[PDB]
Design a protein around this ligand. Sequence first.
Ligand SMILES: N[C@@H](CC(=O)O)C(=O)O
Ligand SMILES: N[C@@H](CC(=O)O)C(=O)O
Ligand SMILES: N[C@@H](CC(=O)O)C(=O)O
Ligand SMILES: N[C@@H](CC(=O)O)C(=O)O
Lengths: 311, 313, 312, 327
Amino acid sequence: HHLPNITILATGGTIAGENLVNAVPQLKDIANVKGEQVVNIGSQDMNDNVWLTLAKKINTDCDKTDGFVITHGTDTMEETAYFLDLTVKCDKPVVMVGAMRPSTSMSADGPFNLYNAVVTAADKASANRGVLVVMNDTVLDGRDVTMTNTTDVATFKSVNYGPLGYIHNGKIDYQRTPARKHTSDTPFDVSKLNELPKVGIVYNYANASDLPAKALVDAGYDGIVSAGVGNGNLYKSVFDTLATAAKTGTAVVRSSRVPTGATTQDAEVDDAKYGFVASGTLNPQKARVLLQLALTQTKDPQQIQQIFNQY
Amino acid sequence: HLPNITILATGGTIAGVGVENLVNAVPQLKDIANVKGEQVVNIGSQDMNDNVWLTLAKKINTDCDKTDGFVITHGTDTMEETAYFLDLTVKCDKPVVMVGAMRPSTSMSADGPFNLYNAVVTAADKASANRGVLVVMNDTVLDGRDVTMTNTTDVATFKSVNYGPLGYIHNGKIDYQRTPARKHTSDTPFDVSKLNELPKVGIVYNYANASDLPAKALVDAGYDGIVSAGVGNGNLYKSVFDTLATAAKTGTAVVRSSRVPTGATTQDAEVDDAKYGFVASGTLNPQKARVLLQLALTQTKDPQQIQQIFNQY
Amino acid sequence: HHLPNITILATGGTIAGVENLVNAVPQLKDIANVKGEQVVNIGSQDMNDNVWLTLAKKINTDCDKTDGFVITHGTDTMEETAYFLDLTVKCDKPVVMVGAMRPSTSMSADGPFNLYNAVVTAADKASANRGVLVVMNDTVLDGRDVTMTNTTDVATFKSVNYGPLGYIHNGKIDYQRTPARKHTSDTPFDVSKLNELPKVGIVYNYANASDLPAKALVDAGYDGIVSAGVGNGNLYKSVFDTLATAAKTGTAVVRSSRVPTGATTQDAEVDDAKYGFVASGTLNPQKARVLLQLALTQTKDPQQIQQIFNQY
Amino acid sequence: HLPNITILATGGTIAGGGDSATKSNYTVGKVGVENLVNAVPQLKDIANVKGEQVVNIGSQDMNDNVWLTLAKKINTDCDKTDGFVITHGTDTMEETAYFLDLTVKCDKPVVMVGAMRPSTSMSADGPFNLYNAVVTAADKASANRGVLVVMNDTVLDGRDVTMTNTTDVATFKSVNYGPLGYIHNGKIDYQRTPARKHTSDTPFDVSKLNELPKVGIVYNYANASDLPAKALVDAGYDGIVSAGVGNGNLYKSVFDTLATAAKTGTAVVRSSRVPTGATTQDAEVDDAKYGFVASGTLNPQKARVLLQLALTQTKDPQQIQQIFNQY
Ligand SMILES: N[C@@H](CC(=O)O)C(=O)O
Ligand SMILES: N[C@@H](CC(=O)O)C(=O)O
Ligand SMILES: N[C@@H](CC(=O)O)C(=O)O
Ligand SMILES: N[C@@H](CC(=O)O)C(=O)O
């Protein structure tokens, strides 16, 4: 039927626990689909190498297909999506999808999710909107998308800025696109990288130990993202250790444990004074993604901050 | 006749200044209560700690028959943790209401004044008793267990994001339609009156390619318990998993919670808690699971007994 | 095996689009001894008073013959029927409503698992004395506060003001809330001998609203009118005037709100006592209609109706 | 150096007042524009403000005349100023905003603002709301984003913005597609812009109009009476918008009346009483068969705005559906 060619890159996850494609015979109505297995892991075990493989795969295979769907565990899909959002140079739709219920359960969500991810990958209007996550009839941008609930099939939301489009009857009404620079408009280029800078996450809370921050420091980590309290604030011991790290060759990004809203400049922390960077709307795991990539370009906290204001 | 209400002041943006100052800026408190202020500490709640926790519980318990209710003025950033600590440790049967402010007192449309007003309204309402320790923010009565910050700056940030609020405040009156089922205050076995420290519990975060070095550092330091902020339904990165499995075998209490802001970390999912001796946190977020785990550790070190605690409180 | 006896009363809805509903979910036999009866077979957009009277009477009459009930229903008005049953069911055992947002033949159709979970809830001894319930997307919701939030989302049903009662995981429920308002055997509404309910209609407010709907309901002698008001139950001027007239010439007038969350309060911009109006509080216009209809079976007096709206 | 900002005042609770800081009771549109401006002396740090009283009412009484007046004044005064703020009641702000979104041709920012607490209330929300509205109207980045609503530190597009709560200061949300930007320390980080066509990309021109087509709204629910629909039909309404159940469905009696109406000279639009999500084509109602139009994400009161303006161009239900799909 003059249909597009869509490539599925499989990484594992609950959606996949070749016969994945076969369980959605209706895919034949909308695309000529071909699958490849890149890895087969639970996304709780997602890592830098898988990321690099995947960006490299998409970038080199871009001209052989019309669109990509990546099948992926839900738990870290939001990280993978932002990492691809920043490192993919291919102009064609790249769509991640997962399932909250196993494939063998009652009212399993994966089949229709897969169908809708292919719809989205096949839609010429999906191009130039960056890397996308399609979950529960909704097209979500790679940067803002996050999990909101541990088990709900509707868990994926773009909690700060909203979704891009809703899918009804195999058609999308797009009403938004992300303003922040993505894909071809980023300076990030991992084509020749076999590793990424080391970036770890420390949590803040009443009476918080400095021992985690200390441990990352002791190991020579290139960057530390703080999951701060409220508007990216730090427990006094963690503050002291990160203040030292920032002046001793470690990039420090203030983010927040709070699920929505920006960690802003000009609030209780003098970031200029400490050599810190404020993560804006990027949650701790998102901020790690961008901090890693920023570190491949620069160690300068003021250039890092600018990166955090543009990507 | 108006109620005697005691404000225990701890600092926070609501104060940023002594407690006398706070009370005198909201003269309308004179129409609903006889307010007395005591300064307990004066800190940003980012610097909240176990010694202040223990001070507050002890104070409230000791001065319970001196007053008709308590309001605790507090920073927002960690209010949700103090409220839960107090919810499990206070034995006083009179209302205990925590408040703060998302905007500085000097700010245009500062939220602090009406927030404090409504906190006193709540503390003064007889209907407020026996509902546990409460947080009052943005015209809403929230329970200390479920209440959490939802946004970094929004005045409406405080929400009980899994089971909802208790009541809404309009024209100085509350319409309560909910009370928390989990055991609280005088129905808990937790008693901190003779404690001068709490057991040591830290929180580690999970994410892609997560370092095991945070968890190992806590283990090396002999931490009594570790709370994991897992991915999805409390899952762990493979390295972190290995580290905590080993720790649990030698007697560290390990609690699986989630970085995901709503919903339960369940038993009977991808992790065989029984096999590993882990505890599942239910709807308790990592900071809240810490509060409960520290208290559970004052009663037992047995993970099945800690799990029953996590199922009842 | 020693399983509870659970009755499915079928009313139609996309979940059906009884005997073959039950057969579609074999896993039911693991949790309940299930039997179905067809009550009606309609899309819930055509839900009506006569079906509500039939359901209430049936549950009340058949209460001793079963351990609990699941009511399969369309999604569009399930929130209405749920609150009607909440106020009229005298049976003490669980009554759980369930529907499906996706057609039964669609990919990832939600009906099978929803129904599984509705039987789980009906079977749970802990579900008793919580009022009539709606079970949708793994969540147990109370009949008073439950409403649609989205036109098509499988997660649409939420208790938007006070939250859910429990969450369902692996066939078990962790309940942490129960509705304070009075329900079921604690209400005085008794529909057992009623062949009809009082006429209550709903008018919508907006900029430049016409009084012509309100005037039509008054002209026809309606027993009450619910206003879907703007903001905190406010009324377009011409609508205000017509409802004021109606309030003093027999018609009970409830101010509710078009706005999806929050109470319509007393003591804002409208002096309800002066006009003889009743504030709906957290009841949305379709829910306020249900309560107003039932109030009007007990009293026409606006203070007593306000008291009912403060208690149920 | 500072921009020129015009405040066109309409009333609302933002200019309302009560008998005490602490009682909820208040009255709307007493206080004049000048009193609001003088309560925010910080305005002086960010704009040269000029205020004009257009009307002084509760937005509950907003109407087609006030809309027409506002649109004509903004289009007429566009070169006199760097941007406009319209102070307005909250209850129908979402309607005026979308009306203006479709009819204003001026290509400078037009920002609407209210308050959920009156000026006399403890922790009154108006003054900071006003300040942030002016910051929004002053920001060169706010241009070419349509008409805006600024409430609780958030910039919202006129089309999607709506009230979600009867009393919460945080009530205004863009419930389907989200906000455009958040305001912190007098600055906006814009991340979105509405895709649907607005202002100078719409064919709607009300400059010569003194009245708009008559369009009413009927609610759906169990046992719905057909009497409200019939009343609108007997008066010769130009259009009727149904606030449907679920995905724009209609109670059988209402369906029967509106079926007649669509083929007997009345435009009918299916919307939904459900607060978020689209009323779609290709669900349970064959719109083509019945001559109906589906509202998409437009709620009943927003769908009335677009239908009224659509009726100024066309009576053809196919053309009206094309309009609901573009604007
Ligand atoms: N642990 C699974 C969860 C899921 O896919 O639902 C994953 O991330 O791989
Ligand atoms: N950092 C402050 C924030 C506030 O109170 O708004 C605190 O938590 O103490
Ligand atoms: N119109 C159907 C919708 C559904 O059940 O999903 C009904 O309410 O009966
Ligand atoms: N009824 C008032 C409500 C408010 O503005 O808060 C108005 O819309 O004018």
